[PDB]
Amino acid sequence: VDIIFRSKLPDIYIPNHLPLHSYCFENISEFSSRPCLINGANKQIYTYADVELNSRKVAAGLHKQGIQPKDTIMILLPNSPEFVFAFIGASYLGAISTMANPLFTPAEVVKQAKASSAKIIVTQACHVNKVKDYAFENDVKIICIDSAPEGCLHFSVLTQANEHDIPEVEIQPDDVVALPYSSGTTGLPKGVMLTHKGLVTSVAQQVDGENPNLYIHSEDVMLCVLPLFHIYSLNSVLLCGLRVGAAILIMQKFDIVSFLELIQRYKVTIGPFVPPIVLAIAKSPMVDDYDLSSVRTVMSGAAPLGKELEDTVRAKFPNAKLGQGYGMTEAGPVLAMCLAFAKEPFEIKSGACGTVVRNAEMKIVDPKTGNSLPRNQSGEICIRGDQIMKGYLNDPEATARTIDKEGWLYTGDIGYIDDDDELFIVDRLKELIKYKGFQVAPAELEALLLNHPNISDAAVVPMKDEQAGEVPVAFVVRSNGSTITEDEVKDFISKQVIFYKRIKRVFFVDAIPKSPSGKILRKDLRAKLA
Ligand SMILES: Nc1ncnc2c1ncn2[C@@H]1O[C@H](COP(=O)(O)OP(=O)(O)OP(=O)(O)O)[C@@H](O)[C@H]1O
Ligand SMILES: [Mg+2]
Numbered sequence: 001v002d003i004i005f006r007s008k009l010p011d012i013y014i015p016n017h018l019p020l021h022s023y024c025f026e027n028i029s030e031f032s033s034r035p036c037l038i039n040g041a042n043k044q045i046y047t048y049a050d051v052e053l054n055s056r057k058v059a060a061g062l063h064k065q066g067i068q069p070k071d072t073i074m075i076l077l078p079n080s081p082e083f084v085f086a087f088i089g090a091s092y093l094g095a096i097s098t099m100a101n102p103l104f105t106p107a108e109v110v111k112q113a114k115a116s117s118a119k120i121i122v123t124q125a126c127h128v129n130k131v132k133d134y135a136f137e138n139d140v141k142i143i144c145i146d147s148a149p150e151g152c153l154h155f156s157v158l159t160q161a162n163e164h165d166i167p168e169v170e171i172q173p174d175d176v177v178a179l180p181y182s183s184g185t186t187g188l189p190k191g192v193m194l195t196h197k198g199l200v201t202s203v204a205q206q207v208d209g210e211n212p213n214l215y216i217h218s219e220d221v222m223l224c225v226l227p228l229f230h231i232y233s234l235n236s237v238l239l240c241g242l243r244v245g246a247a248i249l250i251m252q253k254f255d256i257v258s259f260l261e262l263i264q265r266y267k268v269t270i271g272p273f274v275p276p277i278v279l280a281i282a283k284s285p286m287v288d289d290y291d292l293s294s295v296r297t298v299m300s301g302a303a304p305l306g307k308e309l310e311d312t313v314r315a316k317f318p319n320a321k322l323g324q325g326y327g328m329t330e331a332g333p334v335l336a337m338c339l340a341f342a343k344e345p346f347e348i349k350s351g352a353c354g355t356v357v358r359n360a361e362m363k364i365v366d367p368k369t370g371n372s373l374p375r376n377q378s379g380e381i382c383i384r385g386d387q388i389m390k391g392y393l394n395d396p397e398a399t400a401r402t403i404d405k406e407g408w409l410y411t412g413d414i415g416y417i418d419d420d421d422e423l424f425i426v427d428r429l430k431e432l433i434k435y436k437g438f439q440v441a442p443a444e445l446e447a448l449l450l451n452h453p454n455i456s457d458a459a460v461v462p463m464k465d466e467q468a469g470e471v472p473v474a475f476v477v478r479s480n481g482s483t484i485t486e487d488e489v490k491d492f493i494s495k496q497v498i499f500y501k502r503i504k505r506v507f508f509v510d511a512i513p514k515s516p517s518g519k520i521l522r523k524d525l526r527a528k529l530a
Contacts, residue, residue, distance in 0.1 A: 003372045005417050007358040008339065008346060012209040014359055016200040016386055019171040021091045023200045024242040025052055031218040031245035037081050038221075038249045040262060046081060048245065051088075053163055054081075058089030060165035061158025065120060065141060069094035069169055072179065074118035076100045076109060076127055079228050079250050082145045082155055084238065086122045089158070091177050091196075094169045098179035098191070099229035101516065106130040113140065115191055115393060116179050125149055173197035176390060180231040182329045183515045186428065186523060191393030192329045194231075199239060202332035202387035205357040207240045213357065214325075215297070215343035218245030222270040223263065225251040225277075230517040231333040232301050236325065237272050246270070256280050260290045267294040271320075274302040274518030275309075282312040283456055283479075297341055298322040302518040304425055306447020307351030314350070321345060326353035326425060328411055330402065332387035335362070335411070336423045351447075352422035353415075360385035363408070364416060367429060373416075378426055381415045382408045414441075431522060433462040434469045438500040442522065445472060445503065448496055449489070454482035457512045461525045463505065471504040475525055478508060
């Protein structure tokens with residue numbers, strides 16, 4: 001007998017029979033002349049009508065270039081209007097976009113291209129070298145958004161196409177539309193098949209309903225400073241933004257000053273961040289010199305964030321609801337979303353990752369028995385609903401091990417749900433540090449380290465130890481100014497925690513490695529230790 005957790009919100013109608021473009025643009029007529037994409041680099045504004053129009057032009061363009069239903073294009077781009085136009089244009093065709101980290105090595109880009117069977121790679125001149133030979137040898141066309149050197153087509157060859165030249169197409173709910181990849185935090189990146197049905201479901205779960213979990217409307221301005229090739233931005237910023245008619249402000253590269261200025265300048269109202277952004281915000285002393293009163297909702301997604309740091313940043317946006325969302329590529333991606341974001345906001349506790357999304361079921365399973373758990377007990381987070389992935393790309397066996405025959409997705413994440421239906425993430429199961437019979441969550445310690453005014457960044461990993469099995473160790477970046485000592489660090493931790501959570505060694509460093517998508521690269525630090 002499974003003990004099953006659900007949202008405090010009612011189930012709603014989800015039109016997951018509609019293709020993604022059709023769902024996203026369903027209500028476009030009520031906001032057609034509102035800004036859709038704001039290019040922060042050049043101040044250029046595309047209206048809702050511009051964006052549908054360019055997307056339809058690109059679809060027609062892709063079709064003339066040989067893109068057929070179920071064919072794949074690769075997007076190898078930084079955030080830009082053209083990323084959007086390509087993604088949606090492929091969708092118009094019943095085709096598929098795979099999205100690649102543009103700072104990947106040539107071996108990486110090629111592997112992804114081979115695996116996804118991309119017929120076209122849409123990128124910039126600066127990356128052409130990565131895929132030049134491979135493309136020629138495999139009749140894969142290369143289209144550049146900026147200038148098109150030897151053998152490449154320019155993106156304009158897509159936008160020259162006529163919007164009324166999109167062919168008749170029969171799109172199935174279960175057709176793939178997106179091939180995002182996991183961030184590779186725990187190993188090589190995995191290709192994930194996301195469907196029209198999955199993504200419409202997941203966008204609806206967030207922004208539709210009488211009382212939506214994530215309340216966004218056509219007068220909001222959503223900042224987009226996270227990579228759209230990761231599923232958190234593409235879904236919760238781009239697709240959710242389109243669905244409700246919000247302006248999407250496109251930044252390329254976060255730095256705290258640029259960030260604050262653009263927020264002020266463009267009157268951003270929705271801030272979809274990650275813990276490294278929140279960390280920056282909490283440690284900067286100048287946040288107070290800026291007019292951030294417009295910001296009404298601040299989300300942190302993508303990675304563990306502790307309550308003390310979350311609270312620090314809370315105090316710096318007294319005008320906003322601040323809270324967390326929890327996503328996993330394999331999950332569509334959103335599994336839970338802060339209810340302080342709802343149109344009729346619920347109460348929340350600091351440090352929760354949210355409450356499981358409506359129109360879904362969640363269970364917490366102990367991984368040593370396999371039995372589901374009651375409230376306030378730590379186990380493996382599981383989820384079932386229409387939003388989850390069709391499966392891993394070219395890997396039905398891993399899919400089968402990951403989503404069981406009951407249609408339960410097993411995240412590999414440990415968590416508990418408390419009496420208020422808030423979810424808390426402990427850490428990734430395999431990241432739990434094994435000190436005798438005890439299990440230590442690296443993220444709990446990291447949260448406490450980040451609390452120290454003289455610490456600017458940190459990561460906790462296990463070390464090989466003779467009699468304990470593994471001991472917790474910490475990598476610490478000192479603040480500018482301070483010369484905090486190893487023993488100062490250890491004693492600071494020691495005063496606050498139960499004995500088996502103590503830090504055995506601290507190593508001072510200049511930086512902690514992180515994915516572009518905002519997750520600490522713990523494995524890279526293990527390798528430094530080994
Ligand atoms: N709010 C959150 N708090 C804690 N962890 C989170 C939160 N949001 C996401 N995560 C973590 O991020 C994961 C989703 O990350 P993603 O799908 O980008 O790949 P990854 O797990 O980071 O890397 P890979 O699967 O390639 O090892 C979740 O499984 C969870 O472990
Ligand atoms: Mg993962």
